PDB file of C-alpha atoms in Angstrom:
ATOM      1  CA  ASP A   1      63.270  57.115 242.412  1.00  0.00           C
ATOM      2  CA  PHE A   2      65.213  55.718 245.446  1.00  0.00           C
ATOM      3  CA  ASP A   3      68.500  56.597 243.641  1.00  0.00           C
ATOM      4  CA  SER A   4      67.371  60.319 243.979  1.00  0.00           C
ATOM      5  CA  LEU A   5      67.621  59.856 247.825  1.00  0.00           C
ATOM      6  CA  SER A   6      71.395  59.150 247.475  1.00  0.00           C
ATOM      7  CA  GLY A   7      73.153  61.198 250.215  1.00  0.00           C
ATOM      8  CA  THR A   8      69.854  62.356 251.806  1.00  0.00           C
ATOM      9  CA  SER A   9      68.092  61.845 255.153  1.00  0.00           C
ATOM     10  CA  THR A  10      64.257  61.761 254.778  1.00  0.00           C
ATOM     11  CA  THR A  11      61.358  61.262 257.226  1.00  0.00           C
ATOM     12  CA  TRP A  12      58.281  59.179 256.325  1.00  0.00           C
ATOM     13  CA  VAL A  13      55.010  58.360 258.133  1.00  0.00           C
ATOM     14  CA  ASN A  14      52.494  55.524 257.606  1.00  0.00           C
ATOM     15  CA  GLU A  15      48.718  55.370 258.059  1.00  0.00           C
ATOM     16  CA  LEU A  16      49.209  54.403 261.771  1.00  0.00           C
ATOM     17  CA  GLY A  17      51.429  57.480 262.521  1.00  0.00           C
ATOM     18  CA  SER A  18      54.543  55.234 262.689  1.00  0.00           C
ATOM     19  CA  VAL A  19      57.566  57.308 261.555  1.00  0.00           C
ATOM     20  CA  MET A  20      60.942  56.451 260.076  1.00  0.00           C
ATOM     21  CA  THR A  21      63.929  58.517 259.129  1.00  0.00           C
ATOM     22  CA  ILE A  22      66.056  56.808 256.450  1.00  0.00           C
ATOM     23  CA  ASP A  23      69.533  57.778 255.197  1.00  0.00           C
ATOM     24  CA  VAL A  24      70.189  56.375 251.716  1.00  0.00           C
ATOM     25  CA  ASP A  25      73.867  56.310 250.720  1.00  0.00           C
ATOM     26  CA  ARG A  26      75.323  56.620 247.158  1.00  0.00           C
ATOM     27  CA  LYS A  27      75.227  52.738 246.751  1.00  0.00           C
ATOM     28  CA  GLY A  28      71.586  52.434 248.006  1.00  0.00           C
ATOM     29  CA  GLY A  29      72.487  51.347 251.598  1.00  0.00           C
ATOM     30  CA  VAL A  30      69.648  52.311 254.008  1.00  0.00           C
ATOM     31  CA  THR A  31      70.187  53.098 257.709  1.00  0.00           C
ATOM     32  CA  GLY A  32      68.044  55.093 260.120  1.00  0.00           C
ATOM     33  CA  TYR A  33      65.441  54.456 262.777  1.00  0.00           C
ATOM     34  CA  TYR A  34      61.744  53.607 263.194  1.00  0.00           C
ATOM     35  CA  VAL A  35      59.188  54.709 265.812  1.00  0.00           C
ATOM     36  CA  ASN A  36      56.098  52.458 266.021  1.00  0.00           C
ATOM     37  CA  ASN A  37      52.674  54.049 266.817  1.00  0.00           C
ATOM     38  CA  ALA A  38      50.520  50.891 266.154  1.00  0.00           C
ATOM     39  CA  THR A  39      51.053  46.953 269.945  1.00  0.00           C
ATOM     40  CA  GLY A  40      54.132  47.078 272.256  1.00  0.00           C
ATOM     41  CA  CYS A  41      57.465  49.051 272.004  1.00  0.00           C
ATOM     42  CA  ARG A  42      55.387  52.165 270.971  1.00  0.00           C
ATOM     43  CA  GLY A  43      57.046  55.604 270.809  1.00  0.00           C
ATOM     44  CA  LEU A  44      60.693  54.376 271.217  1.00  0.00           C
ATOM     45  CA  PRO A  45      63.331  54.395 268.426  1.00  0.00           C
ATOM     46  CA  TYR A  46      64.521  51.093 266.908  1.00  0.00           C
ATOM     47  CA  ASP A  47      67.448  50.773 264.507  1.00  0.00           C
ATOM     48  CA  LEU A  48      66.537  50.132 260.850  1.00  0.00           C
ATOM     49  CA  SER A  49      68.649  48.801 257.966  1.00  0.00           C
ATOM     50  CA  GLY A  50      68.138  47.762 254.373  1.00  0.00           C
ATOM     51  CA  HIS A  51      68.735  48.673 250.764  1.00  0.00           C
ATOM     52  CA  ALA A  52      67.060  50.572 247.928  1.00  0.00           C
ATOM     53  CA  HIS A  53      67.636  50.421 244.173  1.00  0.00           C
ATOM     54  CA  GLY A  54      65.549  51.967 241.371  1.00  0.00           C
ATOM     55  CA  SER A  55      61.838  51.806 242.334  1.00  0.00           C
ATOM     56  CA  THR A  56      62.115  49.173 245.132  1.00  0.00           C
ATOM     57  CA  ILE A  57      63.279  49.193 248.773  1.00  0.00           C
ATOM     58  CA  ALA A  58      63.463  46.706 251.642  1.00  0.00           C
ATOM     59  CA  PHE A  59      64.264  47.308 255.320  1.00  0.00           C
ATOM     60  CA  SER A  60      64.144  45.480 258.669  1.00  0.00           C
ATOM     61  CA  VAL A  61      63.675  46.424 262.352  1.00  0.00           C
ATOM     62  CA  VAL A  62      64.244  44.059 265.287  1.00  0.00           C
ATOM     63  CA  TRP A  63      62.026  45.294 268.219  1.00  0.00           C
ATOM     64  CA  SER A  64      64.859  45.272 270.810  1.00  0.00           C
ATOM     65  CA  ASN A  65      66.858  48.496 271.636  1.00  0.00           C
ATOM     66  CA  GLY A  66      68.206  47.765 275.174  1.00  0.00           C
ATOM     67  CA  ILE A  67      65.038  49.415 276.697  1.00  0.00           C
ATOM     68  CA  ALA A  68      61.933  47.473 275.443  1.00  0.00           C
ATOM     69  CA  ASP A  69      62.123  44.047 273.692  1.00  0.00           C
ATOM     70  CA  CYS A  70      58.842  42.984 272.002  1.00  0.00           C
ATOM     71  CA  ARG A  71      60.410  39.569 271.069  1.00  0.00           C
ATOM     72  CA  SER A  72      59.720  40.351 267.423  1.00  0.00           C
ATOM     73  CA  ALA A  73      61.071  41.542 264.094  1.00  0.00           C
ATOM     74  CA  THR A  74      59.449  43.260 261.156  1.00  0.00           C
ATOM     75  CA  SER A  75      60.616  43.529 257.550  1.00  0.00           C
ATOM     76  CA  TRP A  76      59.090  45.602 254.742  1.00  0.00           C
ATOM     77  CA  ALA A  77      59.407  45.373 250.956  1.00  0.00           C
ATOM     78  CA  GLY A  78      58.051  48.253 248.863  1.00  0.00           C
ATOM     79  CA  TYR A  79      57.919  50.195 245.635  1.00  0.00           C
ATOM     80  CA  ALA A  80      58.064  53.958 244.957  1.00  0.00           C
ATOM     81  CA  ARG A  81      54.707  55.481 243.773  1.00  0.00           C
ATOM     82  CA  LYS A  82      54.789  59.117 242.495  1.00  0.00           C
ATOM     83  CA  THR A  83      51.740  61.200 243.642  1.00  0.00           C
ATOM     84  CA  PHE A  84      49.878  64.014 241.814  1.00  0.00           C
ATOM     85  CA  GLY A  85      52.310  66.861 242.348  1.00  0.00           C
ATOM     86  CA  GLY A  86      55.365  63.733 245.922  1.00  0.00           C
ATOM     87  CA  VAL A  87      56.384  60.058 246.342  1.00  0.00           C
ATOM     88  CA  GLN A  88      55.086  57.315 248.631  1.00  0.00           C
ATOM     89  CA  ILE A  89      56.530  53.924 249.562  1.00  0.00           C
ATOM     90  CA  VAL A  90      53.868  51.223 249.125  1.00  0.00           C
ATOM     91  CA  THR A  91      54.965  48.293 251.382  1.00  0.00           C
ATOM     92  CA  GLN A  92      54.012  44.810 252.459  1.00  0.00           C
ATOM     93  CA  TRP A  93      55.402  43.861 255.879  1.00  0.00           C
ATOM     94  CA  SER A  94      56.180  40.493 257.489  1.00  0.00           C
ATOM     95  CA  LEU A  95      56.127  40.248 261.290  1.00  0.00           C
ATOM     96  CA  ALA A  96      57.569  37.417 263.401  1.00  0.00           C
ATOM     97  CA  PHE A  97      57.109  37.274 267.182  1.00  0.00           C
ATOM     98  CA  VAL A  98      57.493  34.706 270.010  1.00  0.00           C
ATOM     99  CA  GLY A  99      54.616  34.551 272.530  1.00  0.00           C
ATOM    100  CA  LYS A 100      53.105  31.953 274.962  1.00  0.00           C
ATOM    101  CA  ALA A 101      52.397  29.613 272.003  1.00  0.00           C
ATOM    102  CA  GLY A 102      55.937  30.102 270.498  1.00  0.00           C
ATOM    103  CA  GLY A 103      56.595  31.719 267.091  1.00  0.00           C
ATOM    104  CA  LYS A 104      53.881  33.411 264.987  1.00  0.00           C
ATOM    105  CA  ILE A 105      54.206  35.194 261.610  1.00  0.00           C
ATOM    106  CA  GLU A 106      51.852  37.920 260.338  1.00  0.00           C
ATOM    107  CA  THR A 107      51.627  40.156 257.299  1.00  0.00           C
ATOM    108  CA  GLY A 108      49.978  43.440 256.292  1.00  0.00           C
ATOM    109  CA  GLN A 109      50.245  46.587 254.165  1.00  0.00           C
ATOM    110  CA  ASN A 110      51.699  50.022 255.090  1.00  0.00           C
ATOM    111  CA  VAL A 111      51.984  53.157 252.876  1.00  0.00           C
ATOM    112  CA  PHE A 112      54.693  55.647 253.892  1.00  0.00           C
ATOM    113  CA  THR A 113      54.410  59.348 252.900  1.00  0.00           C
ATOM    114  CA  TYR A 114      57.412  61.667 252.601  1.00  0.00           C
ATOM    115  CA  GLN A 115      57.570  64.457 255.240  1.00  0.00           C
TER     116      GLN A 115
ATOM    117  CA  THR B   1      69.649  27.446 269.957  1.00  0.00           C
ATOM    118  CA  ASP B   2      68.343  31.065 269.371  1.00  0.00           C
ATOM    119  CA  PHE B   3      70.002  33.769 267.130  1.00  0.00           C
ATOM    120  CA  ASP B   4      72.018  35.271 270.036  1.00  0.00           C
ATOM    121  CA  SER B   5      73.897  31.897 269.921  1.00  0.00           C
ATOM    122  CA  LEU B   6      75.029  32.677 266.274  1.00  0.00           C
ATOM    123  CA  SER B   7      76.963  35.891 267.249  1.00  0.00           C
ATOM    124  CA  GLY B   8      80.389  35.739 265.555  1.00  0.00           C
ATOM    125  CA  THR B   9      79.281  32.860 263.256  1.00  0.00           C
ATOM    126  CA  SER B  10      78.650  32.282 259.571  1.00  0.00           C
ATOM    127  CA  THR B  11      75.995  29.643 258.758  1.00  0.00           C
ATOM    128  CA  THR B  12      74.265  28.316 255.625  1.00  0.00           C
ATOM    129  CA  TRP B  13      70.477  27.711 255.313  1.00  0.00           C
ATOM    130  CA  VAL B  14      68.462  26.182 252.451  1.00  0.00           C
ATOM    131  CA  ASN B  15      64.707  26.741 251.890  1.00  0.00           C
ATOM    132  CA  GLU B  16      62.058  24.359 250.486  1.00  0.00           C
ATOM    133  CA  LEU B  17      62.634  25.764 246.907  1.00  0.00           C
ATOM    134  CA  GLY B  18      66.404  24.928 247.157  1.00  0.00           C
ATOM    135  CA  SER B  19      67.447  28.611 247.442  1.00  0.00           C
ATOM    136  CA  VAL B  20      70.402  29.235 249.742  1.00  0.00           C
ATOM    137  CA  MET B  21      71.510  31.922 252.136  1.00  0.00           C
ATOM    138  CA  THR B  22      74.597  32.451 254.251  1.00  0.00           C
ATOM    139  CA  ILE B  23      74.134  34.630 257.295  1.00  0.00           C
ATOM    140  CA  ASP B  24      76.942  36.260 259.312  1.00  0.00           C
ATOM    141  CA  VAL B  25      75.656  37.504 262.723  1.00  0.00           C
ATOM    142  CA  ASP B  26      77.922  40.170 264.303  1.00  0.00           C
ATOM    143  CA  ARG B  27      78.412  40.684 268.015  1.00  0.00           C
ATOM    144  CA  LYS B  28      75.438  43.167 268.191  1.00  0.00           C
ATOM    145  CA  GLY B  29      72.988  40.983 266.113  1.00  0.00           C
ATOM    146  CA  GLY B  30      73.613  42.697 262.761  1.00  0.00           C
ATOM    147  CA  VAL B  31      73.056  40.268 259.903  1.00  0.00           C
ATOM    148  CA  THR B  32      74.968  40.312 256.610  1.00  0.00           C
ATOM    149  CA  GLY B  33      75.565  37.607 254.009  1.00  0.00           C
ATOM    150  CA  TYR B  34      74.407  36.423 250.604  1.00  0.00           C
ATOM    151  CA  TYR B  35      71.223  34.978 249.090  1.00  0.00           C
ATOM    152  CA  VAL B  36      71.169  32.763 245.970  1.00  0.00           C
ATOM    153  CA  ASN B  37      67.799  32.346 244.184  1.00  0.00           C
ATOM    154  CA  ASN B  38      67.828  28.827 242.641  1.00  0.00           C
ATOM    155  CA  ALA B  39      64.004  28.660 241.887  1.00  0.00           C
ATOM    156  CA  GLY B  40      61.610  29.454 237.208  1.00  0.00           C
ATOM    157  CA  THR B  41      62.757  33.037 237.998  1.00  0.00           C
ATOM    158  CA  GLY B  42      65.159  35.889 237.019  1.00  0.00           C
ATOM    159  CA  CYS B  43      68.330  36.726 239.066  1.00  0.00           C
ATOM    160  CA  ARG B  44      69.061  32.997 239.493  1.00  0.00           C
ATOM    161  CA  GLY B  45      72.363  31.348 240.550  1.00  0.00           C
ATOM    162  CA  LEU B  46      74.151  34.635 241.475  1.00  0.00           C
ATOM    163  CA  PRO B  47      74.819  35.864 245.013  1.00  0.00           C
ATOM    164  CA  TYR B  48      72.836  38.963 246.138  1.00  0.00           C
ATOM    165  CA  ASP B  49      73.742  40.779 249.345  1.00  0.00           C
ATOM    166  CA  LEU B  50      71.357  40.365 252.253  1.00  0.00           C
ATOM    167  CA  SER B  51      71.194  42.477 255.357  1.00  0.00           C
ATOM    168  CA  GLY B  52      69.100  42.577 258.528  1.00  0.00           C
ATOM    169  CA  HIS B  53      69.185  41.945 262.262  1.00  0.00           C
ATOM    170  CA  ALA B  54      68.511  39.105 264.722  1.00  0.00           C
ATOM    171  CA  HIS B  55      67.780  39.078 268.454  1.00  0.00           C
ATOM    172  CA  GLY B  56      66.547  36.278 270.705  1.00  0.00           C
ATOM    173  CA  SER B  57      64.425  33.880 268.583  1.00  0.00           C
ATOM    174  CA  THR B  58      63.517  36.339 265.761  1.00  0.00           C
ATOM    175  CA  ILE B  59      65.274  37.612 262.647  1.00  0.00           C
ATOM    176  CA  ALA B  60      64.438  39.981 259.776  1.00  0.00           C
ATOM    177  CA  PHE B  61      66.438  40.412 256.589  1.00  0.00           C
ATOM    178  CA  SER B  62      66.052  41.608 253.024  1.00  0.00           C
ATOM    179  CA  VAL B  63      67.492  41.329 249.540  1.00  0.00           C
ATOM    180  CA  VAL B  64      67.262  43.950 246.763  1.00  0.00           C
ATOM    181  CA  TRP B  65      67.568  41.994 243.480  1.00  0.00           C
ATOM    182  CA  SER B  66      70.341  44.128 241.927  1.00  0.00           C
ATOM    183  CA  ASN B  67      73.995  43.072 242.346  1.00  0.00           C
ATOM    184  CA  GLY B  68      75.610  44.909 239.393  1.00  0.00           C
ATOM    185  CA  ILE B  69      75.241  41.741 237.205  1.00  0.00           C
ATOM    186  CA  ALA B  70      71.440  41.127 236.952  1.00  0.00           C
ATOM    187  CA  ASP B  71      68.606  43.458 238.089  1.00  0.00           C
ATOM    188  CA  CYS B  72      65.098  41.994 238.573  1.00  0.00           C
ATOM    189  CA  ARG B  73      63.607  45.410 239.646  1.00  0.00           C
ATOM    190  CA  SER B  74      62.413  43.837 242.908  1.00  0.00           C
ATOM    191  CA  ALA B  75      63.061  43.538 246.667  1.00  0.00           C
ATOM    192  CA  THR B  76      62.205  40.745 249.077  1.00  0.00           C
ATOM    193  CA  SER B  77      61.960  40.967 252.857  1.00  0.00           C
ATOM    194  CA  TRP B  78      61.698  38.077 255.332  1.00  0.00           C
ATOM    195  CA  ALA B  79      60.775  38.006 259.011  1.00  0.00           C
ATOM    196  CA  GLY B  80      60.981  34.771 260.969  1.00  0.00           C
ATOM    197  CA  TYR B  81      61.507  32.794 264.154  1.00  0.00           C
ATOM    198  CA  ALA B  82      63.934  29.974 264.981  1.00  0.00           C
ATOM    199  CA  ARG B  83      62.258  26.616 265.709  1.00  0.00           C
ATOM    200  CA  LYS B  84      63.793  23.374 267.039  1.00  0.00           C
ATOM    201  CA  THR B  85      62.221  20.311 265.252  1.00  0.00           C
ATOM    202  CA  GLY B  86      67.250  20.154 263.476  1.00  0.00           C
ATOM    203  CA  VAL B  87      66.953  23.985 263.634  1.00  0.00           C
ATOM    204  CA  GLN B  88      64.818  25.857 261.135  1.00  0.00           C
ATOM    205  CA  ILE B  89      63.888  29.466 260.512  1.00  0.00           C
ATOM    206  CA  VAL B  90      60.142  29.815 259.717  1.00  0.00           C
ATOM    207  CA  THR B  91      59.717  33.006 257.669  1.00  0.00           C
ATOM    208  CA  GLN B  92      57.018  35.087 256.024  1.00  0.00           C
ATOM    209  CA  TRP B  93      58.314  36.961 252.941  1.00  0.00           C
ATOM    210  CA  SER B  94      57.066  40.074 251.134  1.00  0.00           C
ATOM    211  CA  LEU B  95      58.119  40.753 247.511  1.00  0.00           C
ATOM    212  CA  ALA B  96      57.741  44.181 245.815  1.00  0.00           C
ATOM    213  CA  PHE B  97      58.351  44.459 242.051  1.00  0.00           C
ATOM    214  CA  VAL B  98      58.099  46.866 239.037  1.00  0.00           C
ATOM    215  CA  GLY B  99      54.221  48.290 241.291  1.00  0.00           C
ATOM    216  CA  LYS B 100      52.957  44.968 242.752  1.00  0.00           C
ATOM    217  CA  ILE B 101      53.391  43.087 246.068  1.00  0.00           C
ATOM    218  CA  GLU B 102      53.359  39.271 246.638  1.00  0.00           C
ATOM    219  CA  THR B 103      53.667  37.349 249.944  1.00  0.00           C
ATOM    220  CA  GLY B 104      54.429  33.780 251.020  1.00  0.00           C
ATOM    221  CA  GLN B 105      56.195  31.512 253.492  1.00  0.00           C
ATOM    222  CA  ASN B 106      59.683  29.982 253.408  1.00  0.00           C
ATOM    223  CA  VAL B 107      61.178  27.459 255.814  1.00  0.00           C
ATOM    224  CA  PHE B 108      65.025  27.508 255.993  1.00  0.00           C
ATOM    225  CA  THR B 109      66.898  24.392 257.186  1.00  0.00           C
ATOM    226  CA  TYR B 110      70.345  24.803 258.788  1.00  0.00           C
ATOM    227  CA  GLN B 111      73.141  22.976 256.840  1.00  0.00           C
TER     228      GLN B 111
END
């Protein structure tokens, strides 16, 4: 349950080796940071914010940190899935970026495992 | 113009389903405000908090559908870009509920 992360800091990794550390407060506020391993802005920390309640969570990263700006933003929505024994976050992500052709939106799936 | 131009401002946007959001962009591009689902659906006609971040021409924000009044056991995230046509935000959304995931597109029109 995301309410069980109240007052904790936890690190999670997805199938690409992208990592996030999320702090969930007593009201379900989510702060932390994300390191992308996919793409541009690889290996640098980006600020992350969102919210969790019950079995669902959502969080956002803008890919600009004052070092590398990938002219893009990603948001994730997910649900908690308990594993034999652990808990994973099963997400769908939305990506927006501005390139030569202007704005483009993309989508995919990411599963985050608790470390 | 782009989201940097909204720093220190509060603005209202309406999507093609007639749902409404108000976004407050702080001086560092933090986004806070409220979302009202008007679609059909649960958690309808009540403000939910939204949070996210904006920089340049892109924005990302999310809503967890629990506000201490109605809980729809779900979370929606949007990522989008600002487009001049009027100014619109073209978004892709992801919705996670119960566990299942749905996706779609919303276009928000500045009021």
